[PDB]
């Protein structure tokens, strides 16, 4: 659909090298790594979530398009 690429572009950690890209009938892969500093067993104190965002080609040979960069504090989970 096209209402999904918007909620995506609605995002702040879903940034790319070029928003121009076409995001329909495309398949994306998210090889993300998370770092976190706690202050309790559940209540985080700092959260990093980075990692590339890759796309299927007609060959399905994934390729890099954009980057995730989520930063946060006092979280209770990972969005």
């Amino acid at each position: 659909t096209s209402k999904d690429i918007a909620v995506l572009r609605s995002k702040e950690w879903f940034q790319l090298d070029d928003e121009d890209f076409d995001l329909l009938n495309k398949t994306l892969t998210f090889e993300t790594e998370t770092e976190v500093t706690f202050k309790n067993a559940n209540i985080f104190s700092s959260v990093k979530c980075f990692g590339p965002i890759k796309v299927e080609l007609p060959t399905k040979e994934t390729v890099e398009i954009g980057i995730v960069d989520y930063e946060a504090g006092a979280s209770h989970g990972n969005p």
Binding site: V7, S75, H76, G77, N78
Partner: protein
Amino acid sequence: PVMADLNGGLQFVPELKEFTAKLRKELVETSEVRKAVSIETALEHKVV
């Protein structure tokens, strides 16, 4: 005999079919998305 055209002019605005299909096919998007965004953002707000 006579005929009364009580149409406001909707025989001029042409290719009305999709002219109309659009006017609403926009609302659904501009509407549905904000049913999706509003919830995930609220959802987002619920994990942190």
